[PDB]
Amino acid sequence: KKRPKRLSSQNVNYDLKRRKIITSEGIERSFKNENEDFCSACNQSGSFLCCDTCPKSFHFLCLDPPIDPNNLPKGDWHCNECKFKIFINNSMATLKKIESNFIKQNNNVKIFAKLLFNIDSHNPKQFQLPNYIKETFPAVKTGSRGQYSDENDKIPLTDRQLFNTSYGQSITKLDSYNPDTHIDSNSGKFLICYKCNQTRLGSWSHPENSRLIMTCDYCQTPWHLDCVPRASFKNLGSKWKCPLHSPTKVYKKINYKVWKKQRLINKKNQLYYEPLQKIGYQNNGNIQIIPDFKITQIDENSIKYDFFDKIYKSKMV
Amino acid sequence: ISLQIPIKLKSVLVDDWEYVTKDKKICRLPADVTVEMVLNKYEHEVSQELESPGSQSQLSEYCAGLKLYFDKCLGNMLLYRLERLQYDELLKKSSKDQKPLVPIRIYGAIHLLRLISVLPELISSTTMDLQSCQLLIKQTEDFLVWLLMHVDEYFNDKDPNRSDDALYVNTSSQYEGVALG
Amino acid sequence: EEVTFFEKAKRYIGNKHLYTEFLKILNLYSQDILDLDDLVEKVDFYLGSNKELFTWFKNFVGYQCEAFGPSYKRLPKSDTFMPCSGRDDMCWEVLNDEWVGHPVWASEDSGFIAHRKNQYEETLFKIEEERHEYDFYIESNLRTIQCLETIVNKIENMTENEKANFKLPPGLGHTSMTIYKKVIRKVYDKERGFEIIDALHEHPAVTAPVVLKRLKQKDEEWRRAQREWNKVWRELEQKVFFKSLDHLGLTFKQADKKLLTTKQLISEISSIKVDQTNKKIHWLTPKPKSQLDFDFPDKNIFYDILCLADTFITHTTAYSNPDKERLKDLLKYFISLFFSISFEKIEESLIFNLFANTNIYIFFRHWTTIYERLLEIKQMNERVTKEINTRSTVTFAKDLDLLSSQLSEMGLDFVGEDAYKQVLRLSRRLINGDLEHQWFEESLRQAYNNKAFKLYTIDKVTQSLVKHAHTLMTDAKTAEIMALFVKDRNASTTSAKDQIIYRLQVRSHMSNTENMFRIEFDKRTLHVSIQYIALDDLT
Amino acid sequence: DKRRVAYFYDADVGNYAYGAGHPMKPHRIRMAHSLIMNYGLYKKMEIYRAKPATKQEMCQFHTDEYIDFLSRVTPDNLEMFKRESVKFNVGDDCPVFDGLYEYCSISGGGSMEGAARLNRGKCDVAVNYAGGLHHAKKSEASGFCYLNDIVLGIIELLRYHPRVLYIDIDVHHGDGVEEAFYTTDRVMTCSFHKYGEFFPGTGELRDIGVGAGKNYAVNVPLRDGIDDATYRSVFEPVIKKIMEWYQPSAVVLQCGGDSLSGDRLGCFNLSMEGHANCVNYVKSFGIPMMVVGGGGYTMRNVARTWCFETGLLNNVVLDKDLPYNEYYEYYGPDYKLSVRPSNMFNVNTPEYLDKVMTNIFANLENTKVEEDSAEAKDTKGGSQYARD
Ligand SMILES: [Zn+2]
8 A cells, every 4th residue: 555645754855856855954053154969970970079160070189180078279170161161261372273273382292182182172081982882782771870890790780679668578488488489480380400309399287397499590590599598589790690601710820811701792794603624723712512702512422522532631641 | 974993992091990980090100101101102113014105204294293292192182190299299209309200200001092092182172174074083993903913912801909019009098088078 | 532522611601791791701711811710710619510511621630828808908107006005915925017908898889778577567666666765865864863862861871061071083883984964965955054064073072962863863763754654665566576577577468469460470480490491401302291380288278279269259349149150160170170189077167190281270379378387387387376375474474464365365376276277267258258357367477476477368379269260161272172181080990091192182283372281190199290381392 | 594794883884974975875785784693683693893905915915006095095096196086096987075985995905805704714604784885996997996906805715715716696707806816717707787789798608718718708698687587597507517616615795786677887687585595506515605795786585585685695595574674764665675677678588598608617627014914813792782
């Protein structure tokens, strides 16, 4: 029988708040009488500075002169192309031929002089990859704030699924009986784990015998959480790569070689195929199985042949 | 106006984007090879390779223009927001050292590749003669193939987690805090 | 068998994409890129289960560095150089300056999710802050009172000449310098707080008495407010805390409804079937005939469940009286025949092979679930009975009345009586529909210390069992199956020669889409076994 | 057997609150001390009050500017203090409160005072409930932790002991201590916590250290709802193997109610008996022990379980009867010294714990101003009137 009416008192009301007691009862007589909030130079958030006559707002570090909050300049702060527009070279000394005599003064640098002239008439900004670079690799895409995101990165979960997903069903599925994770909706069959050939769904009378399973983000291969060394599921961050695919980077100490893959090429003319030799090609990986960046149409016979040849070569040592 | 880039340096640029934005790895600015010696070696090699029919003057003009453009463009369209604070540290150090610091003495060729990649967006954004456009894009092609012939000694894949020199260093928590804050 | 190893691996893998990835891994080892350790780690997940193939691979290949985990990337030596004033040589030699961890790298720029708590647990946390802020302010005030009381005691034996000049540094002659600043900041205004703490610091013995009086009356009113709030806090937390401790039981009222259905039990037995068949196909051609076995160590539980069913017969109104009577006699006689109980000897009711359809299987699964729930109740009953029988209530809370007497008023307490019999009567009145369900929920929460979470829907599972047993007689196929079970059961040595005719006659009796369940029952040790042979004989 | 125990409690450590609706609460330590006094444990114990740490007495792990910021930080002038508020990561996840410098100084002083009392040999078990912060990095604040006083205690122990072992038993494990002792050989870090979309996100089965600290970091990821029996099975054999191989000279234990059944951001299902029998087991070895408390977002259960660890460290068995104190209204309706375990699912399977144990064994078979330095100076503090 909670009573927040009379037992709530008057000096201290509902907490995480205050009341008029600290102001009305505080007499001491002992002394006896245009701007933007998107930072259109790196498309991120943080501490902001803005110009009086310019709607563009930048970051403290996203400027050609790097300044800090502890020693910010006094008075008006006013932009680089704003220096070119609201100040000199556009208000007085009108732009008639200043570009040309900039070459005439800077000792015939004309092939880069117009770019150097346009440098001052341009906002300082973070690096952005061009469109024609990005369309070359279809597996990568731009993030929300402008970050790298290949196929290795999982899509962010929606806020509806992230927070309001009821109480019994958790995102990591660590509580209560959850038989829907063991049955795929593609065919209605049971997800057989790769290591142990058991779904291990268990029973409702004995929930403790249930073993958690997860599908792969690439080949949809089921895997138990106890077979692979792993505590809980993978829901935020990169996509859960099962330990059965080609790693992006391997280490072979010899100092060492990284071989950070080649992250695939679109179906345009850059993707070139030429199968010629199956034994001793030395193609350093980057193959595909069939029934510049050079890739070969390798098959089961060629891989098995060269693997046997290498292991018969190395068994003297 | 169109410019093409060989796929090795495109992959290098994409790996740079992944290292900075995703892996949070800034380039090792105290490096062995910088932009100035890159262009110096390019000039020397393509000078001793071919004859001298008068192309050495435009060679020197192109390399000087590239050096000046990299000097005055480095903090304008290059330099990811993560690396802005790193730029701030050495600019403050040069202010304390009473010396003028220009990019080409400490910055590596990856930022030059970034500038090459973003070149067409300012080539299309400025009013300039077509013959000079073709000359610029051509000299860009020779610089690109020369960098392709020397990609192993200049862009070697190394992990900073176990090697002293990898043309890349891992970012600290505090560095990331100031950079993204 | 080197020329047959790749074919064996192809048959074992099955999926084509996984085989292509295995070929890529083998080629990566082949082009002097992958060393022996990485290959062995790959085959640990590839062919780890196949012990013979793995041993052959290890013998044939010849298998006889740092870990560098995903976190703690190595920092450059540039970030190492800082003054490090408080570090001596041993401190440099134990501490690594180039390894730093950041949880955002662990999150891969995606953040982290916290464990969601039930609304009872959320309001328990809310009331935790309600109780925290009050007494935190209160005892900070008492610390200030003891400080100013020491000051006043030093004042009381000194004269006006040193009263005028009593300059003190920040801290008021104590080890702390910020508690008093905080409390006089909280009591007064923000701008007036600075001036009052300033005057306090530089001119004591004139503003200190009135400040002490104000803080003392603030203490009195804060303690009165806390004592007023304590009763509301206690009566709210008495029903909030035990409901907060229940995590699976809060959703049990819907989880039991969603999970104790036909399709879920069929899925959970077919999963065990395919698990056993795949494991034996991997290991050995013969297949065991036992799966999902239940133990029957107690006999009185059947009579208790019969009592619950009998209570359900006299409560519902959706059935006819002859229907209710026939269902009750059938429900009793099913136990009287299947478990070889000659007669039900209860007085307080207030090998053999069985082939059955899916309705009988769901009905028997419901019975086994209720049986196991009551086993969980009874097995710890001898401990909870002495727990509530020896419930040593503290006498100090008896003096000023803080014990939870919410269930003691209407008689839901378990003191002075066996817990299992009281739970049986509670289930009877819960089926009767005059128990105010959430009060029974709370009683089960603080009766067996939240461990009795499976008996929350005893009326629901009893209703489901009654509805499933209603289909045993209305359905012509199920009734004929029951009658042919009457003809089959004779308590005579006729095994291994009559059950084949039973199987053939029920295969001809049922349809293709109907499921069959071989429920094997043993008289000795009261053991049961259910075997899933779905579509193993019509092929 | 019988062992003298030193208790370090400060009357000012509970007077600072992090903020409204905050998980971390230093107020629980004061009622833990009140329950200790009310149980009559002062007759078989000696208790001192540790002095607050100074500026350079706080610098044996962290950088100078971090301590300078932590000393000069104040919620009033937080508006212009923004450049290094995100750096050290203060104010975003760990808000600034009044008395932050005093709280850090008190916690650190208690930590190294317990370490020095262990080193000198007057006491065998050191208990410092005033500070058990373990999430603080070299120049970063996380988990509402600002000073990693446990690292200071470990190095103070290393000033006299050759080997120091750190044991963490609560969720939100100490990544700062492992970062401090990732490459050293004479310090071994052992921790028990949950993994998978968790706030630290650090600590792998492969995370065993690098360089000379290879195979010297023990990390045991767990799951939701681990009860007392499986926690016993995951604690006792691996702890016995750690003592039989590493053979430490001192043990630093981070007790706390974060891993209890009831917690805010916690995920475990440990009762008071499950959380305390592990402490009894590690105490049964007889080697010196340092006990710190820096975990637990709940308060009514944390006070009771800390009283229970204090009682079993006094080699007595506490009764279930709970005497009256001035925070008697916090406890549950039963009003007994009993942290009731919840009924949530035990998804911690035995075979996963077995595999973790096997790979941990395979890792550990390879194991086979400064004027007031060295601490050893505390106020007596024998006149405590916390008994009610
Ligand atoms: Zn924690």
